[PDB]
Design a protein around this ligand. Structure first.
Ligand code: FE
Length: 52
């Protein structure tokens, strides 16, 4: 699956990994993330991510 980078801090959202600690199971596509999900490292909104 796809990876997306936070343009602010360099965190990579990997759809295969999800973000379980913040309520996101593995295999969740970036577009399926809740509108109020943010970068777990720097707090940036989804708008600041770019698909790799
Ligand atoms: Fe970030």
């Amino acid at each position: 699956m796809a990876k997306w980078v936070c343009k602010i801090c360099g965190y990579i959202y990997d759809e295969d990994a999800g973000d379980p600690d913040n309520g996101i199971s593995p295999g969740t596509k970036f577009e399926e993330l809740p509108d109020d999900w943010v970068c777990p490292i720097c707090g940036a909104p989804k708008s600041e991510f770019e698909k790799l």
